[PDB]
Design an enzyme around this catalytic site. Structure first.
Site, short mmCIF file in Angstrom:
data_model
loop_
_atom_site.label_atom_id
_atom_site.label_comp_id
_atom_site.label_asym_id
_atom_site.label_seq_id
_atom_site.Cartn_x
_atom_site.Cartn_y
_atom_site.Cartn_z
N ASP A 1 0.80 -1.22 0.00
CA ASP A 1 0.00 0.00 0.00
C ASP A 1 0.83 1.28 0.00
O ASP A 1 1.30 1.74 1.03
CB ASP A 1 -0.93 -0.01 1.22
CG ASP A 1 -1.75 1.25 1.39
OD1 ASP A 1 -1.79 2.10 0.48
OD2 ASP A 1 -2.39 1.40 2.46
N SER B 1 -1.32 15.86 -11.94
CA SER B 1 -1.48 15.59 -13.36
C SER B 1 -1.59 16.91 -14.12
O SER B 1 -2.00 17.92 -13.54
CB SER B 1 -2.69 14.71 -13.66
OG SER B 1 -2.90 14.64 -15.07
#
EC number: 3.4.23.22
Lengths: 7, 329
Positions: B35, B198
């Site tokens: 994770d 992004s």
């Protein structure tokens, strides 16, 4: 099921 | 040294992936979920409340190299409410051949019902930055962190598959693993997360809207959560799609051929295939399916979970100033 790992 | 280990989907839906990890002496092998959105290495153990155990468990007292880390304790809750806590041991941990001594192993005294009901996950492995480790009163180091000294290169790569197994590499980048070049992008660690931004998004053969999307790379998360209007932008291109309070997210006829989603990484463009976004029939044999892209309004952060990550070869550069590489596969 659906996992959303530490907020 | 370096390390290679296989990661396989726990089910048909790719809800999560588990990797085999070897704990203690002699090696006890558990399948933990790697994770990148958390920083705790914990597993089901001999110490866990028996009615709460349905998992392979770690038994401290059957390991010679195990040592109790006195007075230390942990307690963690994750994005979905699930949580667990216990005490701490240090012990030798091995991933795909990469071996670390003295790693903190968090022994679970109690775990929430969701963990109990997942028989496939025996524990978790934090690959986020160590500031999020819940060990009290002195935070423990993650596997990667501990390993960085003896890594040929201080990097790890995620190569998750679409309904297929994949690989986690530590110490090297397998050039055969991807297509094109890797575009690296800056990482913020203010939030302790592999947090980045992004450059934008493109739906289907539509235009690339240039917009800045701060999210995290989270392998512990299934879906891809983006702001509400991006997501709307997506689904509106799918005739049958609508949001459903009952399911809690966008639903669409399973027979739908889903458009691609493109996200930015620098001047680079990652393209998630339409299929990746069909997640599954809301119940077995249903006509309606659940969408792989959903609003993150309620969460409070944009999350690039597994549906977006399996679309690419991902590099987690652990240099002193960390970076994130993305390459198509």
């Amino acid at each position: 099921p659906h996992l959303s790992x530490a907020h | 040294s370096t390390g290679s280990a296989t990661t396989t989907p726990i089910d048909s839906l790719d809800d999560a992936y588990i990797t085999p990890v070897q704990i203690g002496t002699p090696a006890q092998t558990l399948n933990l979920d790697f994770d990148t959105g958390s920083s705790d290495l914990w597993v089901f153990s001999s110490e866990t409340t028996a009615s709460e155990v349905x998992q392979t468990i770690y038994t401290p007292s059957k390991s010679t190299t195990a040592k109790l880390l006195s007075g230390a304790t942990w307690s963690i809750s994750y994005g979905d409410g699930s949580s667990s806590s216990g005490d701490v041991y240090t012990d030798t941990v091995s991933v795909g051949g990469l071996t670390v001594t003295g790693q903190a192993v968090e022994s679970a005294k109690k775990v929430s019902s969701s963990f109990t009901e997942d028989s496939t996950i025996d524990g978790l492995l934090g690959l986020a930055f160590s500031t999020l480790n819940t060990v009290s009163p002195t935070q423990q180091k993650t596997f990667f962190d501990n390993a960085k000294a003896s890594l040929d290169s201080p990097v790890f790569t995620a190569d998750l598959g679409y309904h297929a197994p994949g690989t986690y590499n530590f110490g090297f980048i397998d050039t055969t693993a991807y297509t094109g070049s890797i575009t690296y992008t800056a990482v913020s660690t203010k939030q302790g997360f592999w947090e980045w931004t992004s450059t934008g998004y493109a739906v289907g053969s539509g235009t690339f809207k240039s917009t800045s999307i701060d999210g995290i790379a989270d392998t512990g998360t299934t879906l891809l959560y983006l702001p509400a209007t991006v997501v709307s932008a997506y689904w509106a291109q799918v005739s049958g799609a609508k949001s459903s309070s009952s399911v809690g997210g966008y639903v669409f006829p399973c027979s739908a051929t889903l458009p691609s989603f493109t996200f930015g990484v620098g001047s680079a463009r990652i393209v998630i295939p339409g299929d990746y976004i069909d997640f599954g029939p809301i119940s077995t044999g249903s006509s309606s399916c659940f969408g792989g892209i959903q609003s993150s309004a309620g969460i409070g952060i944009n999350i690039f979970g597994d549906v977006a990550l399996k679309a690419a070869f991902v590099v987690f550069n652990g240099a002193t100033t960390p970076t994130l590489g993305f390459a198509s596969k």
